[PDB]
Amino acid sequence: PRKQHVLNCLVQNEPGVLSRVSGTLAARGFNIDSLVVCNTEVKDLSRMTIVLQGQDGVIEQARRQIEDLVPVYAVLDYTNSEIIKRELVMARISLLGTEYFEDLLLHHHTVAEIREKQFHPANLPASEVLRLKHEHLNDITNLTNNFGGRVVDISETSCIVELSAKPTRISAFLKLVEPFGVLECARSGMMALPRTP
Amino acid sequence: GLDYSFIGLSGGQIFQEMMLRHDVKQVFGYPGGAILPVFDAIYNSPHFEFVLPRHEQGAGHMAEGYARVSGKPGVVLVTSGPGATNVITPMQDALSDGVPMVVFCGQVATNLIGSDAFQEADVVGISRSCTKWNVMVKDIAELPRRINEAFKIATTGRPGPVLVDLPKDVTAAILRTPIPAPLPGDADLITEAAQMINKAKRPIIFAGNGVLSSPEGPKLLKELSDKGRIPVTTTLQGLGAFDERDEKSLHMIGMHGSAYANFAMQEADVLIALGVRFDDRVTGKVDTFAPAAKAAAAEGRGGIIHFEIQPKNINKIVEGQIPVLGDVVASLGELVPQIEAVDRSAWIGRCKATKERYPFTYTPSQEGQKLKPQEVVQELDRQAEALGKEKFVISTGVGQHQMWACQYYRWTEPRSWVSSGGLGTMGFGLPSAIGAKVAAPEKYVIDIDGDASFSMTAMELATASQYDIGVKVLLFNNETNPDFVKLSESMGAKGLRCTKLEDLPRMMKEFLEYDGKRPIVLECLVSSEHVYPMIPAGKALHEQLLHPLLR
Ligand SMILES: Cc1cc2nc3c(=O)[nH]c(=O)nc-3n(C[C@H](O)[C@H](O)[C@H](O)COP(=O)(O)OP(=O)(O)OC[C@H]3O[C@@H](n4cnc5c(N)ncnc54)[C@H](O)[C@@H]3O)c2cc1C
Ligand SMILES: CC(C)[C@H](N)C(=O)O
Ligand SMILES: Cc1nccc(N)n1
Ligand SMILES: [Mg+2]
Missing domain, CATH: 3.30.70.260 (ACT domain)
Structure with missing residues (x-):
């Protein structure tokens, strides 16, 4: 087994x-x-x-x-x-969305259609880019708050979330925040301490 | 609170003082630019005899055989890079067979470590897997404590090899500043074992290398066997722990052990395992090993009693019903006073009967053809028994001859058996013999090597002649092979060749009579046969394969 x-x-x-x-x-x-x-x-x-x-x-x-x-x-x-399974994860998530995110994915292996997609920053005014970055930020923050996490760093393009929970919750949160565009993440791997329960 | 013993001393001066503090009288090694500050500090010191072999592998095997005869760590002193990597095989062998060994090797200056400089190798990383523990002395202030830890680790618990990586700039430096400064098992479990032994209907003693740890081991093993009328069998590395000319003594047990020990072990209702890891070449097939002990355990009337000092070897291969963690010679000390003598005539008779019905046998060389290998060993056993069995130390290579020595040479003397059984390194016989003759220069140190094993280390005969180390080589040859006579006399070994049973006693006597401070090779033109008894793949011990005239 x-x-x-x-x-x-x-x-x-x-x-x-x-x-x-x-x-x-x-x-x-x-x-x-x-x-x-x-x-x-x-x-x-x-x-x-x-x-x-x-x-x-x-x-x-x-x-x-x-x-x-x-x-x-x-x-x-x-x-x-009876152990207590926990794991710390840090994740940098892009606020630019899955449109723009493909540009980065394309250009770290290097586009015509992708840069003509409706909600790509080049086709949008500066405020809707600002509003959508904060909307994406608001979704990521509400998501990481729901799992017990914290938004640690925020920049013009991305943000860093910190979360510590069961490794199941960690994998679920990463997969759940995947469509925003995880630029880089660092999960601790499972850590444990025995419980008396 | 500071120790001033080493103030003002260089690395090599600290070293030789640390060697004296560990009663180190004999060292083996090979020079090199990365260990010269330490090499010149020991070679030229008269406290330590230095032996320069032709190969660093020989030095490690010479330290192994030295450590087997003199139950104390064999010290090795090789250079960095190629020198140290040559000792990897002897180091793993010491770890596989539990031989105390301390390897001091050089290393490039600490500023060049990691730069892949000249003769730089990750010696601490290569030895890491094959050594019990290792370290790299990063500052001269560490040197005395790291050496203390090296010897302490190499000699405590199950003995093993340790390696101390010595950078050139550390051992060439000067310390201009001071520095800060045998237990038995559980009494109630020992008692439980004795009570199980006394109530046993047919017990058997199983002696391994752990019994040879202290000279009091065989003395207490004889006491356990006499006071309990219990037969004794041994692993290949337990040879010498029990006097095999005793009628109580079953001989070696295992894949090529005696049929009577293979038979009696399977009928015994109680196992007294004394310092033995249950090798696959001992059990044959793990689930089929000792079925009578297994059944006696299910009913609570017996089972396996296991004395080991290493907790990882208890219940690792065979479920022991009474584990006794701790030194076996100390555990025996509290054991034999609790053993009551009981009538075991029938049990001894049963064993003695099979011992006479299934002995080590073979069809001798009927005509005047090449020697049967068993005939050469039997003639050595007869002449050694007459000359005085206690005066003999016998080493072997790895092959058929290795089993012949276990089967047809009778083992009586503790720590007179120097063979590679855990790793099975061929070529071990000759350097280990050179190391044995060094630890006991007054004894007949015989090397039972084969043509293929001897060929892996035969250049060390030049080392034996250079230092007047009279090892007596008993070479088994069958045939692609050189002329081993002209080969031996090339480097001072006044060898000779035998080729017939009618010729054998004279050649065996002249070969033993030769100068004990002068090496000699007795080449024997031998007709290599099979080894019987044998355990086939996946068969039990009592499904043994005696065959010549016993089928
Ligand atoms: C070609 C070949 C064939 C072989 N076939 C056989 C065979 O048929 N039969 C056979 O028996 N062997 C055979 N061997 C050898 C076999 O592979 C093992 O190496 C051998 O069985 C070792 O047994 P051992 O436990 O006595 O020695 P070790 O492997 O050295 O184990 C000794 C045990 O005693 C313990 N110990 C040491 N000191 C103490 C102490 N002070 N207190 C308590 N415990 C201690 C150690 O922890 C260790 O576990 C063969 C080897 C070769 C090369
Ligand atoms: C404890 C361990 C991680 C140690 N620091 C090492 O270098 O291997
Ligand atoms: C050393 C050595 N090499 C190969 C086989 C063997 N048995 N031993
Ligand atoms: Mg051969």
């Missing part, structure tokens, strides 16, 4: 242990779907969350192999337990 698994590791904060831990999973032919690693309040210790797909049998012996590593102090397979 190829299920998805989440490993939390307490690990030493020396160089190479990420390469050693990442490599230990690669030895077994494991693709790290997401990994998060940072310092603890203890400067010489780091906590990391590893997310991957595999059957529990192979994943358990992989987990027991990782924990054997010298810089590794503990690895917990939090998959079959």
